[PDB]
Amino acid sequence: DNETLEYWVTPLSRRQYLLNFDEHGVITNAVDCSSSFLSEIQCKTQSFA
Amino acid sequence: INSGTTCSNDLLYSNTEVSTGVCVNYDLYGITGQGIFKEVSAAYYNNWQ
Ligand SMILES: *[C@@H]1O[C@H](CO)[C@@H](O)[C@H](O)[C@H]1NC(C)=O
Ligand SMILES: *[C@@H]1O[C@H](CO)[C@@H](O)[C@H](O)[C@H]1NC(C)=O
């Protein structure tokens, strides 16, 4: 019947994010603050745009 | 400290009503402070929040 087992694993570490909470209190967006330059601008302005 | 359900019954008091409109002190299961309450119809709390 064309099925597959999949189990993707990545490691964890302690780092700072910028999280976005909507009206209902759900996390809808996130950005790792030390991944790129746009992420650096987004975490220094605390804005997703 | 000052949040949770492992409470010390060295100083014991009785439960009061959550009165709105007036400036009060509060002790809400550990959280202390001063302020004004107002009952709202909120729908963003889960079973663990
Ligand atoms: C399973 O995948 C193959 C791919 O070649 C396809 O030909 C076949 O029809 C698929 N079976 C079902 C039940 O979809
Ligand atoms: C101000 O006083 C009135 C009665 O003296 C009371 O009903 C009202 O709640 C008070 N307002 C505040 C903000 O404490």
From Swiss-Prot, chain A:
Glycosylation positions in this chain: N2
Disulfide linkage: C33-C43
Function: Attaches the virion to the cell membrane by interacting with host receptor, initiating the infection.
Protein's name according to its UniProt entry: Spike protein S1
Organism in which the protein naturally occurs: Human coronavirus HKU1 (isolate N2) (HCoV-HKU1)
Residues of the full protein shown: 250 to 298 of 1351
From Swiss-Prot, chain B:
Superkingdom to which the source organism belongs: Viruses
Protein task: Attaches the virion to the cell membrane by interacting with host receptor, initiating the infection.
Protein name: Spike protein S1
Natural source organism: Human coronavirus HKU1 (isolate N2)
